[PDB]
Amino acid sequence: GVDEPSTHEPAEKHLSQCMRQCERQEGGQQKQLCRFRCQERYKKERGQHNYKREDD
């Protein structure tokens, strides 16, 4: 039990590790490959199934 709500989940950090490498790399094809791979691979690892689109 001992269940309690929280914010700033570790999931964005796993993505952060990727995007850290993705962003660090510079170019055309290289940039795009890390942009999706990091976004899709890590998003899936979250366990989330419902995608929501940020406004603005």
> What single-letter amino acid sits at 56?
D
Tally of residues, the chain? 56
Task: Tell me which long-range contacts 33-39 makes (C-beta under 8 A, separation of at least 24).
Answer: 39/15
Q: Show the tokens assigned to 9.
A: 């989940």
| Structural biology method used | NMR
Residues 6+ apart with CB under 8 A from 39: 15
CB of 21 within 8 A of CB of 35? Answer: no
